[PDB]
Symmetry: D2
Subunit: 125 residues, 4 copies
């Protein structure tokens, strides 16, 4: 599975953080976001989806995933979703834009959502 | 399961589409996005995450999910991620912003990502 | 001008705030963003552009503007841009999405930008 | 000076396009958005604002501007806004995110707006 094998592996973003992802044969993404070094308390579950039969015209493979920022010892009461595309080749990349929503009271809702972007480079199979 | 029972159920967005979601005990979100009526060809898998121990200060519960727009008969080579928060009460709602990325060649990548927002209203447990 | 006269006026957003705008014959937007009552210390300059010959097929009129949050007495070291479209009719609207960027250090650039949305309703011309 | 002097000039983005901007002493931004070479049919007016007394603690200078995609010969019935911040130094940058809304009917309004990002490098 071409998109499946291309997406699956370890990726690192522009901030230095690490994302380990497994693309399944049914379109599922599962893995873990790790901070810049890899210690337990800095790791969070990610789950998402990808187009498991992408176009064959040179376009990338659409995908997205979510991290809720709660693990077994921390909770930032917030969730980030990355939306983007895997672009293959010797120099494969996942180009994303992201939305980070914090839980807020309705009065503070206007400032609940950060937006950003990140490019991931593959580090390992 | 306060946030668990609040989120789980059937929801309707402002466009009229339906979102059936199950929030699990471990923070997973799993479900199906459908058009207005529920016809098989119009249904897509959704997977995401939410804060399963949210704050108790009146803030909403952060969450996110992804739909890759491929099912058993259609494929739009794109994925949308909703990022937002569930706000409880009798008038319960999920307020989100979303990112829809289409797979594209690198020359078209500047127009790969739509942004929007949607409020979901609960219609059934 | 139809879009010129439609956009020109006083508008109020979903948060209660006030947007006073003049749409010029050449596509310029100029005005002031204030609070619910127009307290002088709460007034900021806005500048923007609009499509001064928009479609007449029922589409709205594209437009955008910027407020830098600095005035005679306050400076939040930030700027919001709104992007959207004017839709005429008896109860006219401007539907927008907005980006708010704060000056940050490189290390905090990742959280420099909030995203949201607002619908403005016309109150006076 | 100083965010004034840093911002003012010619910038080029990641796609190769050009923006010429003047930052005014009152917080105004004015200029033109063009293509790679400055073909007249490809020029559009931009207007915006910036923080004209930014922090000095190393933070960038917040700014934003709009281009409506209509000039003397073309109209794409759309407008982009960039929101970002100017960071000085020898290799000066403006890091932005942007929103491009097209005029739509209400039925197409859900797909009216593209989002993206761009880093501008000063060229002149
Ligand atoms: N590697 C990355 N790190 C950042 C981006 C998108 S995900 C983000 C890290 C998010 C960690 C959880 C967190 O800090 N959540 C609370 C953020 C609220 C910030 C308050 C605000 O300025 O609105 N990519
Ligand atoms: N209920 C909702 N429907 C819309 C919003 C965010 S998800 C979206 C439906 C997306 C369906 C899949 C789809 O049409 N994918 C391709 C979209 C690219 C459109 C190209 C263009 O005209 O710019 N919420
Ligand atoms: N009427 C509106 N008010 C809000 C929205 C978009 S414009 C915004 C008001 C912005 C006022 C200036 C301001 O507070 N700037 C700095 C805010 C940074 C918050 C930092 C964070 O929590 O991420 N619409
Ligand atoms: N240098 C840049 N070029 C792109 C980004 C943000 S501004 C954008 C250029 C936009 C030119 C005007 C334009 O094409 N407007 C209509 C966009 C139609 C998108 C619909 C589609 O084909 O999917 N930066």
């Amino acid at each position: 599975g071409s998109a499946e094998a291309g997406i699956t592996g370890t990726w690192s973003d522009q901030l230095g953080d690490t994302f380990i992802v497994t693309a399944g044969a049914d379109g599922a993404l599962t893995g873990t976001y790790e901070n810049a070094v890899g210690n337990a308390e800095s790791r969070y579950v990610l789950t998402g989806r990808y187009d498991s039969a992408p176009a064959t015209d040179g376009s990338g493979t659409a995908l997205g995933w979510t991290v809720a920022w709660k693990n077994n010892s921390k909770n930032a009461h917030s969730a980030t979703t990355w939306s983007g595309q895997y672009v293959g080749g010797a120099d494969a990349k996942i180009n994303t834009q992201w939305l980070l929503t914090s839980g807020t009271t309705n009065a503070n809702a206007w400032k609940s959502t950060l937006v950003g972007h990140d490019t991931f480079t593959k580090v390992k199979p």
